Amino acid sequence: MKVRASVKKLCRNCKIVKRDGVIRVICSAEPKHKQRQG
Amino acid sequence: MIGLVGKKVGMTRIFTEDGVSIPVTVIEVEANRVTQVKDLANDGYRAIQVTTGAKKANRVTKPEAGHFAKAGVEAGRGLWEFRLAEGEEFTVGQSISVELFADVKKVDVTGTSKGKGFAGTVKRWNFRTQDATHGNSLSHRVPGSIGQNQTPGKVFKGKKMAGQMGNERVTVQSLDVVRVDAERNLLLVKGAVPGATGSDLIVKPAVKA
Amino acid sequence: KVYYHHTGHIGGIKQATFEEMIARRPERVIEIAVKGMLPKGPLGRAMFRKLKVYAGNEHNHAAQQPQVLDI
Amino acid sequence: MIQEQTMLNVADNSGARRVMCIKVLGGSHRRYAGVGDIIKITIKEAIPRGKVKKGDVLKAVVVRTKKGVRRPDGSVIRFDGNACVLLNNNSEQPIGTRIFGPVTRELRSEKFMKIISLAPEV
Amino acid sequence: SRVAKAPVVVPAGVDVKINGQVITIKGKNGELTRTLNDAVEVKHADNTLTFGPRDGYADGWAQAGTARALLNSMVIGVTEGFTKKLQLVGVGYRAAVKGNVINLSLGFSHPVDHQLPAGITAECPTQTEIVLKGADKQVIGQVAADLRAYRRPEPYKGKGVRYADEVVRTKEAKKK
RNA sequence: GUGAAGAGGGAAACAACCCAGACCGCCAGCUAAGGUCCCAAAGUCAUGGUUAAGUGGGAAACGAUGUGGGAAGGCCCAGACAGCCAGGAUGUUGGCUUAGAAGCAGCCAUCAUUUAAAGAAAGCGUAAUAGCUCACUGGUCGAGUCGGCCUGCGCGGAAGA
RNA sequence: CGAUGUCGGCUCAUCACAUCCUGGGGCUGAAGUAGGUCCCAAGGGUAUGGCUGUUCGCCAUUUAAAGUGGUACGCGAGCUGGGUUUAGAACGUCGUGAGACAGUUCGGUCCCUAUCUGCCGUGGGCGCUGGAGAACUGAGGGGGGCUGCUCCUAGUACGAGA
RNA sequence: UGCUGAAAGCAUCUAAGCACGAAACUUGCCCCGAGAUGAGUUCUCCCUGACCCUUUAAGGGUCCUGAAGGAACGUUGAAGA
């Protein structure tokens, strides 16, 4: 899984949920959008 | 349950029909005479001293003679104490024979291996030899470069060095028994076991899971 | 915690947790740490010989016999 | 030992006249070949009616060795020379149409059934 | 929490038996149903069961909300029960589960053959559907996680065991 | 200024940093640098204050209602933000273009009807559709809650023999 | 500067971890077979021949992978001396010329009788505080770790067939 | 990676709770270990009398009374520099 420093407002449709103590980003308004950051 | 002390008398082959050779080790097991049973007004644990031998009447010493005197007028040369598991033993019963293996024919064997003196630096440690020509001389079987420059800068533990070798304990867990004869003191086992002819060993019914 | 220790075999090192130390080394986890705060020189060994820590509420001193230290 | 640069005689019909082995095949860091091994081979002399030429590279099966076949009954099934049959790498089986002599009956046991029907009386 | 205004009243047909280790709940759709909330203390009465702070235990006003969350689901579990969430999509798959025995064909060298937790049974009402009979909301979920483990639904057909997520999508598989 | 052209040390150990600067002692007082939970001599001293992490005891653009300080602002008791409910229609099978399009391929109108309330549509998804999201209003819920900025302290981005 | 052997070989090895293989997880223009490609994990594993001193490269062929780097680009009181290199020769370039040339090719001697640290085996002396003979515990200490080929599961699943 | 579920009445694999998860970690598997002064245990064998001279943990003698077993001797070894 690729690693980044932030998610930087990439799409407003994202809820930015915490799962198991880390952020999990998922989106419907942008394809292939998956991020472990908030 | 317990173990037996024997005498390794050689190796041979017994075949099958029409072929396959079936190599087998030949062992003689004179019935182990018993010297002591514990948890019977002696010690807090269940164990038997199985003993084999008798020594010579003008060579046996007082501290050994008086240690076998509870069991008889012969110094049985050793105790061989085994703790009891999945069974029982009492102070009355026949001297322990190869009928221990009448139905349990998978065993494990403990004994000392390769009693062959010093061997040699390469004959022991399986090194790669240097060039016999091409300008190389004086070095061929010496142990080699024993480390590396400055940073670790020391000789390691768990490495290969010369000394007096062999006659140390090995345990074999995959063995099947081919035949036993309690009336002729015979044990016949498939394949090979540690130590040369005359070796004593320990043979036990298998307890491995 | 980590409790790093050199076994005497080159870079060979052991590590533990405080959970593991009380689960399988409860008499030794204090023994390896108190010696580093005894006096310097031969008096350190002379005080360490008096330490004798036990766990599981049972000792070899039932006729000496150790009484409770109180204020 | 049958290994790199070992020269073998062919039991292949109208086959190659001088052939030499390379590598060993069958396993990682493998040592040496014997009866029932297939090895990579090179042509040095082909004979004028050969359909291969010098420096062509093939495979061959070892059918006899001067060390023989082991473990029948504790003895050994002995032979006097190292001999092979060249194989077709594109179509499998021998490169020729027949085989010279009975070769070895170990080819009838388990693994070489498509070879003992081509010509061998075994 | 802000939920203690609605402590949930015991409905006519449900019984709760009071014990200092594991309290049990009984109803006509759930028997031998267990509750364990050791981070809190109860106050049980002939028509109510409420949660309060436990002696020597530290809690940031949350553990009685998580304890009420077990009471919330057990009252409906023992009186009505829960929805079916296991169905096979593929046409080449079949099920025949009954009681405490699982027979399920999903294209594997084994008919799944599961031995289950206690207080749950399974039945097939059709050749492609599985219904779990039980009143513990965690057990009927965890058994469904174990049963859906064989052949995941793929974006190219979806033929596995049916599931929902907001990111469920089809793929066009555009080739050659 | 200090060493190279002085002692004493202290900072864990460097010449220089920090303090001191040598005539010599004294079972005498008072101090500087630095130390006072323990190893190791002396406060786990007393006041409130910021951080929540083994940070302190390495690593940036970028980014964040992580945590305090502060002024203005949106939503707010004819009632708030999340959740639950009602929904999110009707004129309408539109009109011009073209072979054609059930809001969501161009431009043309964007009005009126209804209702607590709205668009033949801000953003996805799809066939050209479908299926969703968003605007927005009251019932339930309810007293504080949130975005943006200025700033103090921590945080993530992240490997080495 | 009153000395510190430098690229290569043979032999003896070790550390890192930005993971090549192995054990796993995940995205995908993941249909399937594959590839593209990232992160948990450093316990184990990881190249032969023709040319060249080759480090490197060019080719040929194997393999569970043919991973990267540290360590004075590891191990000449370790052995070697193929390369770098004087003393000889010759072709070129330069110079009036002697001579110069990291231009080129050829050729070119390697010292040794072991204190203390390190490491293997093995004694005496002393320690266990009455002595002599045998058997036994356990503060601690090391060792190990797979992988091709093929068929049945299956030509089933998947896909327009392959 | 999931089920149940919260502080935050929603949400979420985590806070409580339960279901798993690799050759790595732990157990199992083989060997070494009382220089373990921090010298553990069990059995067998051997030893339990006095006195002179001396202000003496320093000995110099006498009568009475003691070794278990080792070392030595070799002949030798499948022991060994």
PDB file of N, CA and C in Angstrom, chain B residues 125-184:
ATOM      1  N   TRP B 125      35.626 -31.147   9.453  1.00  0.00           N
ATOM      2  CA  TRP B 125      34.861 -29.916   9.224  1.00  0.00           C
ATOM      3  C   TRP B 125      34.456 -29.588   7.777  1.00  0.00           C
ATOM      4  N   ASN B 126      34.618 -30.509   6.824  1.00  0.00           N
ATOM      5  CA  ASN B 126      34.027 -30.407   5.476  1.00  0.00           C
ATOM      6  C   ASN B 126      34.327 -29.076   4.731  1.00  0.00           C
ATOM      7  N   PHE B 127      35.547 -28.557   4.893  1.00  0.00           N
ATOM      8  CA  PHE B 127      36.053 -27.340   4.240  1.00  0.00           C
ATOM      9  C   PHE B 127      36.326 -27.539   2.735  1.00  0.00           C
ATOM     10  N   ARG B 128      36.573 -26.442   2.004  1.00  0.00           N
ATOM     11  CA  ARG B 128      37.035 -26.435   0.603  1.00  0.00           C
ATOM     12  C   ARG B 128      38.544 -26.188   0.554  1.00  0.00           C
ATOM     13  N   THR B 129      39.280 -27.063  -0.116  1.00  0.00           N
ATOM     14  CA  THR B 129      40.742 -26.990  -0.210  1.00  0.00           C
ATOM     15  C   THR B 129      41.226 -25.913  -1.186  1.00  0.00           C
ATOM     16  N   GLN B 130      42.423 -25.382  -0.933  1.00  0.00           N
ATOM     17  CA  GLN B 130      43.087 -24.361  -1.760  1.00  0.00           C
ATOM     18  C   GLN B 130      43.787 -24.998  -2.980  1.00  0.00           C
ATOM     19  N   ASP B 131      44.353 -24.189  -3.879  1.00  0.00           N
ATOM     20  CA  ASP B 131      45.055 -24.686  -5.070  1.00  0.00           C
ATOM     21  C   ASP B 131      46.349 -25.437  -4.713  1.00  0.00           C
ATOM     22  N   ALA B 132      46.536 -26.627  -5.290  1.00  0.00           N
ATOM     23  CA  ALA B 132      47.727 -27.466  -5.084  1.00  0.00           C
ATOM     24  C   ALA B 132      48.953 -27.014  -5.913  1.00  0.00           C
ATOM     25  N   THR B 133      48.756 -26.056  -6.817  1.00  0.00           N
ATOM     26  CA  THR B 133      49.765 -25.505  -7.734  1.00  0.00           C
ATOM     27  C   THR B 133      49.436 -24.020  -8.005  1.00  0.00           C
ATOM     28  N   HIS B 134      49.729 -23.468  -9.189  1.00  0.00           N
ATOM     29  CA  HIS B 134      49.417 -22.071  -9.571  1.00  0.00           C
ATOM     30  C   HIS B 134      50.021 -20.997  -8.641  1.00  0.00           C
ATOM     31  N   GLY B 135      51.137 -21.317  -7.987  1.00  0.00           N
ATOM     32  CA  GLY B 135      51.892 -20.458  -7.055  1.00  0.00           C
ATOM     33  C   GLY B 135      51.500 -20.665  -5.582  1.00  0.00           C
ATOM     34  N   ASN B 136      50.342 -21.267  -5.273  1.00  0.00           N
ATOM     35  CA  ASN B 136      49.917 -21.469  -3.886  1.00  0.00           C
ATOM     36  C   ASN B 136      50.688 -22.636  -3.246  1.00  0.00           C
ATOM     37  N   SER B 137      51.184 -22.434  -2.022  1.00  0.00           N
ATOM     38  CA  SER B 137      51.916 -23.436  -1.242  1.00  0.00           C
ATOM     39  C   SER B 137      51.783 -23.178   0.265  1.00  0.00           C
ATOM     40  N   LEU B 138      52.264 -24.111   1.091  1.00  0.00           N
ATOM     41  CA  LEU B 138      52.247 -24.135   2.567  1.00  0.00           C
ATOM     42  C   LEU B 138      50.843 -24.173   3.212  1.00  0.00           C
ATOM     43  N   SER B 139      49.832 -23.524   2.631  1.00  0.00           N
ATOM     44  CA  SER B 139      48.430 -23.533   3.078  1.00  0.00           C
ATOM     45  C   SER B 139      47.542 -24.361   2.140  1.00  0.00           C
ATOM     46  N   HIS B 140      46.861 -25.378   2.674  1.00  0.00           N
ATOM     47  CA  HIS B 140      45.873 -26.205   1.956  1.00  0.00           C
ATOM     48  C   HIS B 140      44.751 -26.743   2.863  1.00  0.00           C
ATOM     49  N   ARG B 141      45.093 -27.258   4.055  1.00  0.00           N
ATOM     50  CA  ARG B 141      44.155 -27.796   5.070  1.00  0.00           C
ATOM     51  C   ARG B 141      44.064 -26.994   6.372  1.00  0.00           C
ATOM     52  N   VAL B 142      44.925 -26.001   6.601  1.00  0.00           N
ATOM     53  CA  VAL B 142      44.770 -25.055   7.733  1.00  0.00           C
ATOM     54  C   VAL B 142      43.369 -24.408   7.774  1.00  0.00           C
ATOM     55  N   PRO B 143      42.812 -24.082   8.963  1.00  0.00           N
ATOM     56  CA  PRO B 143      41.409 -23.657   9.134  1.00  0.00           C
ATOM     57  C   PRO B 143      40.941 -22.453   8.297  1.00  0.00           C
ATOM     58  N   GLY B 144      41.860 -21.605   7.841  1.00  0.00           N
ATOM     59  CA  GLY B 144      41.625 -20.485   6.921  1.00  0.00           C
ATOM     60  C   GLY B 144      41.733 -19.135   7.623  1.00  0.00           C
ATOM     61  N   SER B 145      41.091 -18.114   7.052  1.00  0.00           N
ATOM     62  CA  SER B 145      41.007 -16.772   7.619  1.00  0.00           C
ATOM     63  C   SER B 145      39.944 -16.743   8.716  1.00  0.00           C
ATOM     64  N   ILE B 146      40.360 -16.510   9.962  1.00  0.00           N
ATOM     65  CA  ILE B 146      39.509 -16.737  11.152  1.00  0.00           C
ATOM     66  C   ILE B 146      38.593 -15.565  11.542  1.00  0.00           C
ATOM     67  N   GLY B 147      38.515 -14.520  10.722  1.00  0.00           N
ATOM     68  CA  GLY B 147      37.712 -13.326  10.995  1.00  0.00           C
ATOM     69  C   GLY B 147      37.746 -12.342   9.826  1.00  0.00           C
ATOM     70  N   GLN B 148      37.596 -11.054  10.130  1.00  0.00           N
ATOM     71  CA  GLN B 148      37.617  -9.952   9.170  1.00  0.00           C
ATOM     72  C   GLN B 148      38.057  -8.644   9.868  1.00  0.00           C
ATOM     73  N   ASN B 149      38.494  -7.640   9.105  1.00  0.00           N
ATOM     74  CA  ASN B 149      39.160  -6.439   9.614  1.00  0.00           C
ATOM     75  C   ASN B 149      38.334  -5.634  10.631  1.00  0.00           C
ATOM     76  N   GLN B 150      39.016  -5.277  11.724  1.00  0.00           N
ATOM     77  CA  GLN B 150      38.765  -4.229  12.730  1.00  0.00           C
ATOM     78  C   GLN B 150      37.355  -4.079  13.325  1.00  0.00           C
ATOM     79  N   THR B 151      36.315  -3.875  12.517  1.00  0.00           N
ATOM     80  CA  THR B 151      34.965  -3.501  12.968  1.00  0.00           C
ATOM     81  C   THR B 151      34.352  -4.545  13.913  1.00  0.00           C
ATOM     82  N   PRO B 152      34.020  -5.786  13.502  1.00  0.00           N
ATOM     83  CA  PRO B 152      33.837  -6.875  14.467  1.00  0.00           C
ATOM     84  C   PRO B 152      35.185  -7.227  15.122  1.00  0.00           C
ATOM     85  N   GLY B 153      36.249  -7.424  14.327  1.00  0.00           N
ATOM     86  CA  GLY B 153      37.659  -7.455  14.768  1.00  0.00           C
ATOM     87  C   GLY B 153      37.954  -8.507  15.853  1.00  0.00           C
ATOM     88  N   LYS B 154      37.309  -9.676  15.782  1.00  0.00           N
ATOM     89  CA  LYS B 154      37.357 -10.760  16.787  1.00  0.00           C
ATOM     90  C   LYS B 154      36.930 -12.109  16.201  1.00  0.00           C
ATOM     91  N   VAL B 155      37.331 -13.208  16.839  1.00  0.00           N
ATOM     92  CA  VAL B 155      36.948 -14.572  16.448  1.00  0.00           C
ATOM     93  C   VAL B 155      35.571 -14.901  17.032  1.00  0.00           C
ATOM     94  N   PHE B 156      34.716 -15.544  16.242  1.00  0.00           N
ATOM     95  CA  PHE B 156      33.332 -15.868  16.581  1.00  0.00           C
ATOM     96  C   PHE B 156      33.199 -17.200  17.340  1.00  0.00           C
ATOM     97  N   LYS B 157      32.124 -17.307  18.126  1.00  0.00           N
ATOM     98  CA  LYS B 157      31.623 -18.564  18.702  1.00  0.00           C
ATOM     99  C   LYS B 157      30.690 -19.265  17.705  1.00  0.00           C
ATOM    100  N   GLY B 158      30.607 -20.591  17.773  1.00  0.00           N
ATOM    101  CA  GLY B 158      29.815 -21.411  16.837  1.00  0.00           C
ATOM    102  C   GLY B 158      30.506 -21.628  15.479  1.00  0.00           C
ATOM    103  N   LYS B 159      31.835 -21.474  15.419  1.00  0.00           N
ATOM    104  CA  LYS B 159      32.705 -21.642  14.246  1.00  0.00           C
ATOM    105  C   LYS B 159      33.407 -23.015  14.310  1.00  0.00           C
ATOM    106  N   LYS B 160      34.241 -23.337  13.318  1.00  0.00           N
ATOM    107  CA  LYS B 160      34.942 -24.617  13.139  1.00  0.00           C
ATOM    108  C   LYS B 160      36.415 -24.520  13.560  1.00  0.00           C
ATOM    109  N   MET B 161      36.811 -25.304  14.562  1.00  0.00           N
ATOM    110  CA  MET B 161      38.188 -25.402  15.070  1.00  0.00           C
ATOM    111  C   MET B 161      38.595 -26.845  15.409  1.00  0.00           C
ATOM    112  N   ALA B 162      39.892 -27.141  15.372  1.00  0.00           N
ATOM    113  CA  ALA B 162      40.446 -28.459  15.712  1.00  0.00           C
ATOM    114  C   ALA B 162      40.440 -28.763  17.231  1.00  0.00           C
ATOM    115  N   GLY B 163      40.468 -30.050  17.585  1.00  0.00           N
ATOM    116  CA  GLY B 163      40.550 -30.574  18.955  1.00  0.00           C
ATOM    117  C   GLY B 163      40.332 -32.092  19.022  1.00  0.00           C
ATOM    118  N   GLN B 164      40.081 -32.634  20.220  1.00  0.00           N
ATOM    119  CA  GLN B 164      39.600 -34.008  20.425  1.00  0.00           C
ATOM    120  C   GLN B 164      38.079 -34.054  20.186  1.00  0.00           C
ATOM    121  N   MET B 165      37.607 -34.969  19.331  1.00  0.00           N
ATOM    122  CA  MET B 165      36.217 -35.024  18.844  1.00  0.00           C
ATOM    123  C   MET B 165      35.492 -36.344  19.156  1.00  0.00           C
ATOM    124  N   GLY B 166      34.210 -36.425  18.778  1.00  0.00           N
ATOM    125  CA  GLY B 166      33.407 -37.661  18.773  1.00  0.00           C
ATOM    126  C   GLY B 166      33.005 -38.121  20.181  1.00  0.00           C
ATOM    127  N   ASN B 167      32.339 -39.278  20.256  1.00  0.00           N
ATOM    128  CA  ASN B 167      31.862 -39.918  21.492  1.00  0.00           C
ATOM    129  C   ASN B 167      30.948 -39.013  22.355  1.00  0.00           C
ATOM    130  N   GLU B 168      30.095 -38.245  21.675  1.00  0.00           N
ATOM    131  CA  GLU B 168      29.042 -37.384  22.220  1.00  0.00           C
ATOM    132  C   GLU B 168      27.652 -37.888  21.795  1.00  0.00           C
ATOM    133  N   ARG B 169      26.637 -37.631  22.632  1.00  0.00           N
ATOM    134  CA  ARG B 169      25.266 -38.160  22.533  1.00  0.00           C
ATOM    135  C   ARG B 169      24.492 -37.634  21.318  1.00  0.00           C
ATOM    136  N   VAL B 170      23.841 -38.555  20.608  1.00  0.00           N
ATOM    137  CA  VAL B 170      22.899 -38.354  19.501  1.00  0.00           C
ATOM    138  C   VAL B 170      21.606 -39.135  19.793  1.00  0.00           C
ATOM    139  N   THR B 171      20.454 -38.588  19.390  1.00  0.00           N
ATOM    140  CA  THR B 171      19.122 -39.197  19.548  1.00  0.00           C
ATOM    141  C   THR B 171      18.431 -39.383  18.191  1.00  0.00           C
ATOM    142  N   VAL B 172      18.034 -40.621  17.891  1.00  0.00           N
ATOM    143  CA  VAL B 172      17.358 -41.056  16.659  1.00  0.00           C
ATOM    144  C   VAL B 172      15.894 -41.371  16.969  1.00  0.00           C
ATOM    145  N   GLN B 173      14.958 -40.723  16.272  1.00  0.00           N
ATOM    146  CA  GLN B 173      13.514 -40.806  16.548  1.00  0.00           C
ATOM    147  C   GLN B 173      12.693 -41.623  15.533  1.00  0.00           C
ATOM    148  N   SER B 174      13.143 -41.776  14.278  1.00  0.00           N
ATOM    149  CA  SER B 174      12.456 -42.570  13.241  1.00  0.00           C
ATOM    150  C   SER B 174      13.118 -43.939  13.044  1.00  0.00           C
ATOM    151  N   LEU B 175      12.628 -44.955  13.766  1.00  0.00           N
ATOM    152  CA  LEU B 175      13.096 -46.352  13.722  1.00  0.00           C
ATOM    153  C   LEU B 175      11.932 -47.350  13.893  1.00  0.00           C
ATOM    154  N   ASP B 176      11.937 -48.428  13.105  1.00  0.00           N
ATOM    155  CA  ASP B 176      11.024 -49.573  13.219  1.00  0.00           C
ATOM    156  C   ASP B 176      11.805 -50.871  13.520  1.00  0.00           C
ATOM    157  N   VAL B 177      11.281 -51.686  14.439  1.00  0.00           N
ATOM    158  CA  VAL B 177      11.821 -52.995  14.840  1.00  0.00           C
ATOM    159  C   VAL B 177      11.340 -54.083  13.875  1.00  0.00           C
ATOM    160  N   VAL B 178      12.256 -54.958  13.457  1.00  0.00           N
ATOM    161  CA  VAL B 178      12.005 -56.039  12.491  1.00  0.00           C
ATOM    162  C   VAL B 178      11.699 -57.357  13.204  1.00  0.00           C
ATOM    163  N   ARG B 179      12.475 -57.721  14.239  1.00  0.00           N
ATOM    164  CA  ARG B 179      12.295 -58.951  15.034  1.00  0.00           C
ATOM    165  C   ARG B 179      12.836 -58.803  16.465  1.00  0.00           C
ATOM    166  N   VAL B 180      12.266 -59.546  17.420  1.00  0.00           N
ATOM    167  CA  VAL B 180      12.791 -59.740  18.785  1.00  0.00           C
ATOM    168  C   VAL B 180      12.727 -61.211  19.204  1.00  0.00           C
ATOM    169  N   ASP B 181      13.672 -61.663  20.030  1.00  0.00           N
ATOM    170  CA  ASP B 181      13.696 -63.016  20.610  1.00  0.00           C
ATOM    171  C   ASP B 181      14.162 -62.942  22.077  1.00  0.00           C
ATOM    172  N   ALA B 182      13.232 -62.927  23.039  1.00  0.00           N
ATOM    173  CA  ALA B 182      13.572 -62.811  24.464  1.00  0.00           C
ATOM    174  C   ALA B 182      14.332 -64.035  25.019  1.00  0.00           C
ATOM    175  N   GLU B 183      14.109 -65.216  24.448  1.00  0.00           N
ATOM    176  CA  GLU B 183      14.775 -66.468  24.826  1.00  0.00           C
ATOM    177  C   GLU B 183      16.239 -66.536  24.354  1.00  0.00           C
ATOM    178  N   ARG B 184      16.567 -65.874  23.235  1.00  0.00           N
ATOM    179  CA  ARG B 184      17.935 -65.717  22.691  1.00  0.00           C
ATOM    180  C   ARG B 184      18.485 -64.286  22.776  1.00  0.00           C
TER     181      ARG B 184
END
